[PDB]
From Swiss-Prot:
Name the record gives this protein: Ubiquitin-like protein 5
Organism name: Mus musculus (Mouse)
GO CC terms of this entry: cytoplasm; nucleus
Record-linked InterPro entries: Hub1/Ubl5, Ubiquitin-like_dom, Ubiquitin-like_domsf
GN (gene name): Ubl5
A single GO BP: protein modification process
Domain Ubiquitin-like: 28-100
Length: 100
């Protein structure tokens, strides 16, 4: 008695030229994914994009799998339901990049 998986669908889309960040806060901040390759990895994202969305990019930038990217800070685990707006991530925040 056991299963796995549920559904597979996405609902995202990027719009060129921020159409005014009214109500829905969407600020741009640079993140630094500290990899274990030696060289750091920076990426551009907005607070509107959650860790998941971010991870996706990272995996897109690095080439890894969005499902193979873990963002940790000191001793804090980042969920896929917590955005940057919650972590108040600052433009240039160094986070521990880890691969599953």
């Amino acid at each position: 008695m056991k299963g796995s998986s549920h559904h597979h669908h996405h609902h995202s889309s990027g719009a060129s030229l921020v159409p005014r960040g009214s109500e829905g806060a969407a600020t741009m901040i640079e993140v630094v994914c500290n990899d274990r390759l030696g060289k750091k990895v920076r990426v551009k994202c907005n607070t509107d994009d959650t860790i998941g969305d971010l991870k996706k990019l990272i995996a897109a930038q690095t080439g890894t799998r969005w499902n193979k990217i873990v963002l940790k800070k000191w001793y804090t685990i980042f969920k896929d339901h917590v955005s940057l707006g919650d972590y108040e991530i600052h433009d240039g925040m160094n986070l521990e990049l880890y691969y599953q």
